[PDB]
Amino acid sequence: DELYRQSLEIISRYLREQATGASGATSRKALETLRRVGDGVQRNHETAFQGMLRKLDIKNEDDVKSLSRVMIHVFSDGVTNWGRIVTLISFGAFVAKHLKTINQESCIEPLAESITDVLVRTKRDWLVKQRGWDGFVEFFH
Amino acid sequence: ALETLRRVGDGVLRNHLTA
């Protein structure tokens, strides 16, 4: 509820910002932390990510809602960490770029809302226990 | 589905906690 609202803001802003452009304190350092680490991941895997984007293929919002069930499975091996969290958000910013390249900037927020659902609604336990976004900021010192 | 996000994910983690 409050974890979700913060999470969504941080994530929406990042995906919207990375779309050819640019209410809390922790949300401040979070977005900056997410900027640094997030941009890094995309560069470091600009080809591995493109390989996912292709084998997934993404034209409409019906696709975007399917990529949801993929992300939810990411934490199926029972393994949850900040590397995976940020990688998911990174791949979201990547998928948000390919989203506007095809004019469908309208699918970006749904994507942001979708990414947040996973973290907040399916991982609230680990997330809450890991000092939320503060822990995210702290971890990626 | 696609679990390669794990590989990159777990990889990005490890490469940070040990830098």
Side-chain angles (χ1 to χ4, degrees), chain A residues 22-39:
Chain A
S23 314
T26 289
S27 300
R28 187 180 190 90
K29 305 190 73 65
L31 188 29
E32 174 48 37
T33 292
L34 181 46
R35 286 185 176 103
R36 191 212 330 154
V37 170
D39 301 356

Side-chain angles (χ1 to χ4, degrees), chain A residues 43-56 58-87:
Chain A
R43 269 142 36 193
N44 289 5
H45 313 88
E46 180 168 340
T47 300
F49 269 20
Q50 196 65 48
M52 286 190 43
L53 191 47
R54 177 174 294 103
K55 183 54 172 62
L56 270 183
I58 291 189
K59 185 177 178 180
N60 55 37
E61 192 181 0
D62 272 344
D63 292 354
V64 187
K65 298 170 183 178
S66 289
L67 185 31
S68 307
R69 312 194 177 285
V70 164
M71 297 189 293
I72 301 181
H73 180 65
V74 175
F75 297 95
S76 95
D77 44 17
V79 169
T80 300
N81 60 64
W82 285 120
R84 297 187 171 193
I85 307 289
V86 73
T87 287

Side-chain angles (χ1 to χ4, degrees), chain A residues 1-19 21-56 58-141:
Chain A
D1 174 19
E2 179 48 27
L3 195 56
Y4 178 98
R5 279 199 61 94
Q6 177 180 24
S7 297
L8 178 57
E9 177 179 6
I10 292 168
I11 288 167
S12 292
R13 291 190 181 274
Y14 181 60
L15 265 55
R16 291 184 301 98
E17 173 187 359
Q18 295 259 115
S23 314
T26 289
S27 300
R28 187 180 190 90
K29 305 190 73 65
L31 188 29
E32 174 48 37
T33 292
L34 181 46
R35 286 185 176 103
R36 191 212 330 154
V37 170
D39 301 356
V41 175
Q42 291 176 313
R43 269 142 36 193
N44 289 5
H45 313 88
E46 180 168 340
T47 300
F49 269 20
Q50 196 65 48
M52 286 190 43
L53 191 47
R54 177 174 294 103
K55 183 54 172 62
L56 270 183
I58 291 189
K59 185 177 178 180
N60 55 37
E61 192 181 0
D62 272 344
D63 292 354
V64 187
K65 298 170 183 178
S66 289
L67 185 31
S68 307
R69 312 194 177 285
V70 164
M71 297 189 293
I72 301 181
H73 180 65
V74 175
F75 297 95
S76 95
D77 44 17
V79 169
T80 300
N81 60 64
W82 285 120
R84 297 187 171 193
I85 307 289
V86 73
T87 287
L88 202 45
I89 300 170
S90 293
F91 188 63
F94 192 74
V95 169
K97 291 168 172 183
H98 175 70
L99 191 28
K100 159 171 174 171
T101 301
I102 297 172
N103 191 33
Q104 266 158 130
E105 164 175 334
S106 66
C107 289
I108 300 184
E109 187 75 4
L111 171 63
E113 296 180 338
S114 174
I115 294 195
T116 305
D117 285 357
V118 177
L119 291 48
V120 177
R121 281 155 195 180
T122 83
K123 299 304 303 178
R124 185 183 287 267
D125 284 353
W126 186 97
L127 186 54
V128 161
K129 290 179 177 178
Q130 189 57 58
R131 311 204 304 109
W133 288 100
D134 285 316
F136 167 78
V137 176
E138 149 71 20
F139 180 80
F140 283 111
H141 178 277

